[PDB]
């Protein structure tokens, strides 16, 4: 498809050889279509954890070590170990995320991860039994005014929805804990997503703000 | 739960007890039938003079609207309820408030282009853009101490909400069809009953389409 050409082109810029570019391509294609596995790596990056592992038979085992002290990352995939810098590790993931990660439909209802809130906010929601649920209002919004990065979703807390007296919320994908129910989608949405949120953003080198491509 | 609350709202009407009871049975039937109730709202907005449906009991519900006379005739079980236009709007407003279903958040709807921007419909037709929208908010109050709500707050699909694409305030009769309902659970059911029905009843807050004052 079109995304495969664009994806291999985003791998040319990494300071690595063509042997490792093919390996990173296969790892990215495999992790991106497995949505639960890719979010686990994002949370590992967010917490600066040290290790990621999503092993399996038939040559599906993937292990990633993040050596935060030496700004090094080791991506092992079928006895082929790929080394690259931490900044190149984030660029690889950012363009994997831009071009290959599924985008949730509008109106999707999700449960967010309370482990990412300040304690005073958690204890306030717990007092009244408010679970951390939300609905997708918008997707991959451009951060103004420079418009050099996007953020994955704009949401409102469920069941209150969008209100006049409360702001919509910008959040990243790693805030999501589970999808309760996806919203409506069809061929119009798939074409719009591919054009506006993948191809047009790739052309302007707009990626998700969490990978912090400076 | 809500049956005795609906009976209370019929005390806002200047009709006899027998007429209140007839209006109760008509409203219990219409609000259960989402498409039938929306058809009546659309007949109201168009100022048509006749409405014809069949209650769940089977008896036909006949409504005659005399706009220059500012009164209405509701016919059910051979009973003719004569009421003013304002009592008609109040009856329907509390029927809607207390009994009409509320679409889940995230529901996808098709908007009737007639009730939408008149000539701008041509603009989205030029690009083949269908009139699909996502429910983002429900029974919205724009500010404090507002005595009326807006049925739904929606964003055009597939663009959604963004800083440069404002959402749209719509009434339930803006909906041509519901394409896919969003997620709902007990949390939503409890919040809908408490905030959008019981609390709005206590404050005399009904849909703005009825324009009671």
């Amino acid at each position: 498809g079109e995304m495969d050409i664009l994806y291999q082109m985003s791998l040319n810029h990494l300071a690595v050889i063509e042997a490792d570019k093919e390996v990173l391509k296969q790892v990215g294609l495999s992790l991106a279509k497995q949505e639960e596995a890719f979010r686990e790596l994002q949370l590992i990056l967010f917490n600066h954890e040290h290790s990621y592992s999503h092993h399996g038979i038939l040559g599906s085992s993937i292990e990633i070590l993040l050596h935060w002290e030496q700004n090094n990352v080791e991506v092992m995939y079928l006895e082929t170990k790929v080394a690259l810098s931490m900044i190149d590790f984030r660029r690889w993931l950012a363009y994997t995320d831009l071009l290959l990660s599924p985008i949730l439909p509008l109106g999707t209802t999700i449960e967010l991860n309370k482990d990412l809130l300040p304690a005073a906010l958690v204890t306030s929601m717990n007092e009244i039994g408010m679970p951390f649920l939300a609905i997708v209002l918008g997707r991959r919004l451009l951060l103004g005014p420079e418009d050099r990065e996007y953020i994955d979703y704009l949401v409102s807390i469920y069941p209150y929805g969008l209100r006049a007296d409360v702001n919509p919320i910008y959040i990243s994908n790693f805030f999501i804990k589970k999808v309760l129910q996806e919203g409506y989608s069809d061929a119009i949405d798939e074409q719009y997503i591919e054009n506006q949120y993948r191809k047009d953003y790739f052309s302007r080198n707009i990626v998700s703000e969490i990978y912090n491509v400076k | 739960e809500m049956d005795i609350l609906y009976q209370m709202s019929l005390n806002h009407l200047a009709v006899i007890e027998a007429d209140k009871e007839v209006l109760k049975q008509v409203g219990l039937s219409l609000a259960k039938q989402e498409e039938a109730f929306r058809e009546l709202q659309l007949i109201l907005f168009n100022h048509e003079h006749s409405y014809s449906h069949h209650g769940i009991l089977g008896s036909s519900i006949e409504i005659l609207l005399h706009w220059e006379q500012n009164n209405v005739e509701v016919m059910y079980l051979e009973t003719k309820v004569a009421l003013s236009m304002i009592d008609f709007r109040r009856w329907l407003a509390y029927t809607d408030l207390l009994l009409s279903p509320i679409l889940p958040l995230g529901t996808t709807i098709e908007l009737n282009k007639d009730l939408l921007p008149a000539a701008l419909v041509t603009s989205m037709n030029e690009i083949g853009m269908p009139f699909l929208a996502i429910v983002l908010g429900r029974r919205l109050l724009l500010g404090p101490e507002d005595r009326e709500y807006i049925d739904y707050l929606v964003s055009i699909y597939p663009y959604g909400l963004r800083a440069d694409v404002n959402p749209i305030y719509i009434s339930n009769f803006f909906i041509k069809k519901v394409l896919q309902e969003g997620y709902s659970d007990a949390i939503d059911e409890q919040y809908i009953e408490n905030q959008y029905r019981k609390d709005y009843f206590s404050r005399n807050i009904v849909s703005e389409i009825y324009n009671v004052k």
Partner: peptide
Amino acid sequence: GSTPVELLANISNTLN
């Protein structure tokens, strides 16, 4: 150029 911002802002300006 995949989002017609001006037409979408016009739909909302009118109905609101």
